[PDB]
Amino acid sequence: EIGTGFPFDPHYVEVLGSRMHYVDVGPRDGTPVLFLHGNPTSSYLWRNIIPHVAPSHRCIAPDLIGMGKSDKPDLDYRFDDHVRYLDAFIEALGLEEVVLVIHDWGSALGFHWAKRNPERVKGIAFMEFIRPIPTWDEWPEFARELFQAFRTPDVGRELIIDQNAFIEGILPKFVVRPLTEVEMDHYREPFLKPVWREPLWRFPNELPIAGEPANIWALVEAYMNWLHQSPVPKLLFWGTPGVLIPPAEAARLAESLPNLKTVFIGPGLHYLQEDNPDLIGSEIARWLPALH
């Protein structure tokens, strides 16, 4: 029964201004074994191979830049981009000599690194690796039309980006046994529809206005009532005309909040820190010792 779990603590190293994730298990010394995945996978692909090797050797399995749990900087993600990031990853880890275990585009990276660093490679295990394919007749007939479409302008991006054809189509098509839903979800995870700007939209939809949404209205009314009764020392900064706290609200708070000091900061709307940070910071500093 082939394992679906990924029982590996995350490790990250900063590389050319981004972070790359990697598996790092086994002893600390000896020759490390460096596992390189390809498209559209991650170190997840090695999850059931690493445990055979970890008892005797250090196992390092990075996620290529833009993949797995690695950062996704704004690159073209051409082969040369992957070369740069993997080169810097190996150097950031201070690796000397390695054994390579490589697959697909990770094999193009590994072989290219090995050719440039032959003294540092003690062995290469490889499988289903990138070699020059002399004609499309040498490409498997059952996947020829699809890969030709991937390489066809516009249509390739529709299939791979809009329809996720490489994860939903190629990946199970190129495994003989059936992948489970848990396994597909691990492969889907780095490429789900991005969170992106969701937090910025959800916040205004939570603002407590005219009783709605009711759960936030109740919670905010509760802490406003707490503030009205609490002896906690309070410091209010307000600007004019303000947004949430106009002058009239500042005066209401002066009437209603115990133990309140109020500072007017001058012109201000909502992000008062951008209009008079020096007064805000200096007044906080002056107020803090009075809290002893």
| Residues tagged active-site | 104, 128, 270
Q: What does DSSP say about strands 121-129 and 59-62: parallel, antiparallel, or unpaired?
A: unpaired
204 binds Cl ion (CB under 5 A): yes
User: Under rule CB under 8 A, which residues in 216-275 are in contact with a second copy?
Assistant: 216-217, 219-224, 226-227, 230, 232-239, 241-246, 249, 265, 267-275
- Which residues, including other chains, have CB under 8 Å from residue 135's CB and lie 6 or more apart? none
Helix or strand run (H / E) with residue 12: strand 11-15
135 binds a second copy (CB under 8 A): yes
Asked if residue 194 has a cis previous peptide bond (ω within 30° of 0), the answer is no
User: Under rule CB under 5 A, which residues in 24-83 are in contact with Cl ion?
Assistant: 39
Q: Which of 25, 36, 86, 167 binds a second copy (CB under 8 A)?
A: 167
- Which residues, including other chains, have CB under 8 Å from residue 274's CB and lie 6 or more apart? none
Of the pair 21, 103, the CB lying nearest Cl ion is at 103
User: Under rule CB under 8 A, which residues in 70-99 are in contact with a second copy?
Assistant: 72-79, 99
C-alpha pair distances (Å), 74 with each of 1, 71, 78, 85, 86: 39, 10, 12, 13, 16
User: Under rule CB under 8 A, which residues in 180-219 are in contact with a second copy?
Assistant: 183, 191-210, 216-217, 219
Size of residue set near Cl ion by CB under 5 A: 3
16 binds a second copy (CB under 8 A): no
Q: Which of 5, 92, 145, 173 binds a second copy (CB under 8 A)?
A: 173
Cβ atoms of 263 and 281 within 8 Å: the answer is: no
